[PDB]
């Protein structure tokens, strides 16, 4: 297991524009196109991201290419963030994967707001961190996904994904 496989499991893979859990237009492997309600706005954002006139459909390769860019961007978002970087630096390989997952899902800013949970992870207080992370909209909206990430922080293993 690795970050790629992990997020592929959590986000699935769709070749046609779709609505995410929040109802926003997305494609591929969790690749958010726009928060705007217009399918045209989304189609426009899609052609610009792919570099071609897509008509709202892309290939597997193209999805994987957005995926790679998106993973990369998340890591880099983390390393640049004064609140995130230090937590990330303090964790083992597994748990880092879990941190990346949340950033990919909610953005650097969203994650950086879990101040209390962040501090708990930095202190290596796994069970406490897991309880705190659960008291959030995040967990109430996408509970199964949140549970898997949370167990990952709690155990330092990939069990939740096996
Ligand atoms: Cl892009
Ligand atoms: Cl879920």
UniProtKB/Swiss-Prot annotation:
Q: What is the annotated localization of this protein?
A: Host cytoplasm
List the signal peptide residues. none
**Mutagenesis or variant effect for residue 26 to E:** Complete loss of activity at neutral pH; covalently bound substrate
Active-site residues from the entry: 11, 20
One of the GO biological process terms: peptidoglycan catabolic process
Top-level taxonomic group? Viruses
The enzyme's main class, written as a single word, is hydrolase
Q: In this UniProt entry, which cysteines form S-S bonds?
A: none
This enzyme's EC code(s)? 3.2.1.17
InterPro entries cross-referenced by the UniProt entry: Endolysin_T4_type, Glyco_hydro_24, Lysozyme-like_dom_sf, Lysozyme_dom_sf, Phage_lysozyme-like, T4-type_lysozyme
Which CDD domains does this one have? Answer: T4-like_lys
Gene Ontology, cellular component aspect: host cell cytoplasm
Q: Which HAMAP family match?
A: ENDOLYSIN_T4
Q: Which family does it belong to?
A: Belongs to the glycosyl hydrolase 24 family.
Known role: Endolysin with lysozyme activity that degrades host peptidoglycans and participates with the holin and spanin proteins in the sequential events which lead to the programmed host cell lysis releasing the mature viral particles. Once the holin has permeabilized the host cell membrane, the endolysin can reach the periplasm and break down the peptidoglycan layer.
Q: What protein does this entry describe?
A: Endolysin
This protein's species is Enterobacteria phage T4
């Amino acid at each position: 297991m690795n970050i790629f496989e992990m997020l592929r499991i959590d986000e699935g893979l769709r070749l046609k524009i779709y609505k995410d859990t929040e109802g926003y237009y997305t494609i591929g492997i969790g690749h958010l196109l726009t928060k705007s309600p217009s399918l045209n706005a989304a189609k426009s954002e899609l052609d610009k991201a792919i570099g071609r006139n897509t008509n709202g459909v892309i290939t597997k390769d193209e999805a994987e290419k957005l995926f790679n860019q998106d993973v990369d961007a998340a890591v880099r978002g983390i390393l640049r963030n004064a609140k995130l970087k230090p937590v990330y630096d303090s964790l083992d390989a597994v748990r880092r994967a879990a941190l990346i997952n949340m950033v990919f899902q909610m953005g650097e800013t969203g994650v950086a707001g879990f101040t209390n949970s962040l501090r708990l992870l930095q202190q290596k207080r796994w069970d406490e961190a897991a309880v705190n992370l659960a008291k959030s909209r995040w967990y109430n909206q996408t509970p199964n996904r949140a549970k898997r990430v949370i167990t990952t922080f709690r155990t330092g293993t990939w069990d939740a994904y096996k």
